């Protein structure tokens with residue numbers, strides 16, 4: 001295992017949707033002064049040298065003059081790592097959180113790949129808010145929850161290299177939710193095999209967990225990876241409307257020909 005490297009995919013359309021949603025959840029959590037935890041089970045290397053799927057993702061939005069307000073926090077982090085105006089580095093989920101989180105907040109990050117873990121550690125060598133471990137991310141849903149702050153965003157973002165991930169994300173969410181039922185859980189998934197995503201969502205419904213939102217962006221109709229999504233348990237109350245505001249613009253820029261779709265809907269509605 002562990003042959004996947006996120007550097008091959010960083011900044012693609014999936015990362016754009018994923019990090020849009022991650023950023024909006026973090027900004028909502030920051031509306032209250034009380035600290036919160038950011039927990040990243042499959043954290044990656046931290047930052048990625050781009051120079052090419054990023055050309056069809058982040059490159060198509062980060063310098064647009066009419067950037068929706070819902071993208072400003074995210075795109076400002078991307079600009080922070082590229083102040084020359086040239087697209088050279090892409091900040092992964094840990095660096096988006098590192099820049100958006102406040103002094104009082106905490107980060108718990110895990111990465112198993114033996115070359116990418118040390119790169120991730122280096123990004124946080126002077127940041128006492130963060131802990132970085134070379135450990136199984138699914139175990140952290142038991143070990144690190146609930147946070148003492150009793151507030152948090154948990155991002156579960158595996159590569160689905162091992163087909164066991166389709167079941168492990170549901171089991172892992174169930175274990176995390178048992179320990180921390182008020183947290184916001186954001187699960188990223190690819191659409192390579194639609195029926196396996198339907199199977200996964202069926203298993204998730206069967207847990208009995210309520211308030212489950214689904215955000216999906218497809219660059220092509222169902223048929224490699226044609227789409228990806230974010231399943232969000234306990235979304236901030238504004239998230240659905242924020243996505244209805246921003247998904248049409250996002251899909252039109254990421255997919256100029258109009259193929260595919262961009263939807264927000266409920267798996268388990270209120």
Ligand SMILES: Nc1ncnc2c1ncn2[C@@H]1O[C@H](CSCC[C@H](N)C(=O)O)[C@@H](O)[C@H]1O
Pocket residue numbers: 002004005006015018040041042043044045046091092093094110111112113116135136137138157158159
């Ligand atoms: N069991 C496991 N525990 C922790 N990390 C794992 C894992 N299995 C695979 N990985 C790592 O999971 C990552 C998925 S890509 C993660 C990207 C990151 N969240 C971002 O948005 O920037 C890869 O870096 C891979 O090495």
